[model samples]
Target: SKGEELFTGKVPILVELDGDVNGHKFSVSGEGEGDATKGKLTLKFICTTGKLPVPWPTLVTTLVQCFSRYPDHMKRHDFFKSAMPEGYVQERTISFKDDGNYKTRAEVKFEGDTLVNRIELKGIDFKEDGNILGHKLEYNYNSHNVYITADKQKNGIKANFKIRHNIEDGSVQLADHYQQNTPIGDGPVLLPDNHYLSTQSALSKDPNEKRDHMVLKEFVTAAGIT
Candidate 1:
């Protein structure tokens, strides 16, 4: 079956998580657009702090705390209602001008065991030759992580991806990217040294010893995207 396509156009993400181990805050915001099927797309993350911290309170917990601020709005989304339980929390919004001569804004709020967060992107023309669309992404409880990519061809190949990493009980999410502007059916992209060796070895192992390898092979063969 085909997967869901939640977002369209180029969605570049610039997210920052701040606070202490007891609890932290986050803001993700960006702008972009271009075709994704005929061209190449890339996403890069440069951590100024060197390493990403496993913030306290957990990602989901913090999100719940933030959304509680807008009690009436939170009721509109089933996902929010179930995640945030009916406590005290933090709240605020900041506005500033970046060096690019654009105004930027961020908001964080907490009340009644809920947290609300928002960010504003300035200098972005949403009504240009492109459009921006948003949708809710699904979370699979059976897997440790989920990776999804959406592609479309317009002015160029426009694609976006969402990667969710969950371990123990906490989670970290990453997404969006810039268009690489390359041809689609070029050649097999090289894999990392360790992962390439691992994939190769698994493919050779007995089916019973590495069932996942066989499953992945079938999946790729069916999709024919690689």
Candidate 2:
């Protein structure tokens, strides 16, 4: 069986309001046919800093309050924090005085159409006084852009929420930032964890033009593409 990669070039998808939400930009590079039946998706997360200044929360309070009230959201929070995890930092618990920043990134790959997804995260984690509880922070998905793939018949969706605390003392009673239903449309969104199959059309043709120029901005206009 042969495999292929998905998008090329870093895509910038802006999903943030206060800070930078630059999304990863991409274009399909190659593709092939094979039995994508049984496989797993692994996620590798890392944290990075941005150029402009953005608000940030202290490690101690973030971890202590993040899931303490909304335990049910732990799984949902993990989906966003999938880019940062504990253990990346040797400290069992982080000190409030720590000056280092975090970088968030992830890699995921899946096999076939099965819904089974396996994931892992690296980089920063939530800490209380100094203990690492959650592998990844719960509110880091605000800076994420996901390329996705499922059964050709099915579509993909990525959801996220970000919380910001008072720059002074990590008081998190604010609305922070939120993005929902971020419909990525058809095809797989390229992330470290997902495998990609290049779409031949994305390589040569101007994807935007194909829709805007080739078609009359009509829904049925896409029939000419496939």
Candidate 3:
């Protein structure tokens, strides 16, 4: 709740991340609307602009596509799961390891044709210096997908990650990665909608453009992000 004020509106937000993918330089920027409630999400990425010897274009694309869908896709996880018409949410907390740490668990149980369920775990750590960090994870039992993320700052460097995995497809996508010495900040920064608008305009003007901007536009708009 300490940072809940940062996401109190339906306004746009941006988050920038920079890190390495298997030792290759990687960086991406995400822009969208909504907050702890709901909204849309989009991304821009740059891989190895001559700063690194290797580039993982394919892996970068996969990461981008997967994160671009987070606004909607993450709802499948209990951590962001919404209660159904006749369902409800249940939560509990447990302490361990001399009570120095604890876990918060939650579930959204839905009564429907499939009786869908979602679960989330938040592990809290309290350091001797009174510093605190959280490790959060969520998985979708219904779809056999997993989402895990963690972060810590030390020696003026912050390390972070967001990963999504699909068991059936054998695909692992890294939605976010940040390991910069200084702070790599987030959004509502500038024309957050610039990329989406530019792509739409390009597709409209270029009849020769064979790419499917239509689908992209539809999906982006559906998230109601920007």
Best by TM-score: 3
Clashes of 3: 3
If scored against the real structure, what TM-score would every candidate get?
0.20, 0.19, 0.25
Residue 121 of model 1 has an lDDT of: 28
Better of 1 and 2 by TM-score: 1
Number of the predicted model whose lDDT against the real structure is largest: 3
Model 1 residue 109 CA deviation in Å:
15
Model 3, range 1-226, lDDT digits (tens) per residue?
1222333344343333344322334343333333233323332223223332222221221221111232333333211212222233333232222222222222222223222223233334433322111211111111112222211332112223332322224534233332222111221111111111100100111255342111111122113233
Q: Tell me the whole-model lDDT of each prediction, alpha carbons only.
A: 0.21, 0.20, 0.26
User: What is the TM-score (0 to 1) of candidate 2?
Assistant: 0.19
| Runs off by more than 4 Å, candidate 2 | 1-51, 56-154, 158-166, 173-176, 180-226
Instruction: Report the Cα lDDT for residue 203, model 2.
Output: 10
Question: Model 3 misses residue 48 by how many Å?
Answer: 6.9
Query: What TM-score would you give candidate 1 relative to the actual structure?
Result: 0.20
lDDT (Cα, tens digit) per residue for candidate 1, span 53-171:
32211122112111111122222221211222211122222111110111223333222322333333232222221111111222221211111122243111121223232333353
